[PDB]
């Protein structure tokens, strides 16, 4: 952590593993964050490393903006775009925070198709048994 912080000029880079589920707002937080870098409004000052970004809570961040148009080349070869590049990451992290993702919704579907049967069926039986009670008739025939 110290050798980490030292080069970062007192800043501490957080772990990115689950950082999706950590910060509020979901992944959209990240994408538009890396998206947004504005010009400082008139009448506001910053520290040198600190850069003004609206989303970040203090709006002063020691992260220099990583992305410009086409920082890389892709294994695919799709043009590298600040917008295209950014989103492609913000999908990745979403997978790291729940690697089970694509697997779980199977049951999510598959339990519903299962469950469509029971609830009426069970509800079929319930009225069947009780049907003797709701059919009652009383009469009061006193020798009186």
């Amino acid at each position: 952590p110290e050798a980490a912080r030292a080069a970062n000029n007192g800043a501490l880079p957080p772990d990115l593993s689950y950082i999706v589920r950590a910060r509020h707002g979901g992944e959209d937080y990240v994408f538009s964050l890396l998206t947004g870098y504005c010009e400082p409004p008139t009448g506001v000052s910053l520290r040198e490393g600190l850069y003004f970004n609206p989303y970040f809570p203090g709006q002063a961040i020691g992260m220099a903006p990583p992305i410009y148009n086409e920082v890389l080349e892709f294994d695919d070869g799709t043009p590298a775009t600040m917008s295209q590049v950014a989103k492609d990451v913000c999908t990745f992290l979403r997978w790291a925070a729940e690697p089970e993702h694509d697997h779980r919704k199977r049951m999510g579907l598959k339990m519903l198709l299962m469950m469509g049967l029971l609830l009426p069926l069970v509800y079929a039986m319930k009225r069947h048994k009780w049907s003797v009670l709701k059919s009652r008739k009383l009469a009061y025939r006193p020798p009186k």
Binding site: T42, G43, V44, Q84
Partner: protein, 67 residues
């Protein structure tokens, strides 16, 4: 080159009413600040309320326009 899809979609939304409408206040605040910047004042508050209304439009358009 590649111009990004982003910036292109940026300008169409800011061409809407409330974007430019609130953007007016920016100049209004700033130009005042331009005189009064010596005071504690900043327009950052106003800058923000601009950004929100902007991106709501930006929300739908470009994510489609991507690959």
């Amino acid at each position: 080159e590649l111009v990004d899809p982003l910036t292109t979609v940026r300008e169409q939304c800011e061409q809407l009413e409330k974007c430019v409408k609130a953007r007016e206040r920016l100049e209004l605040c700033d130009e005042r600040v331009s005189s009064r910047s010596q005071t504690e004042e900043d327009c950052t508050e106003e800058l923000l309320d601009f950004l929100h209304a902007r991106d709501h439009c930006v929300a739908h358009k470009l994510f489609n326009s991507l690959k």
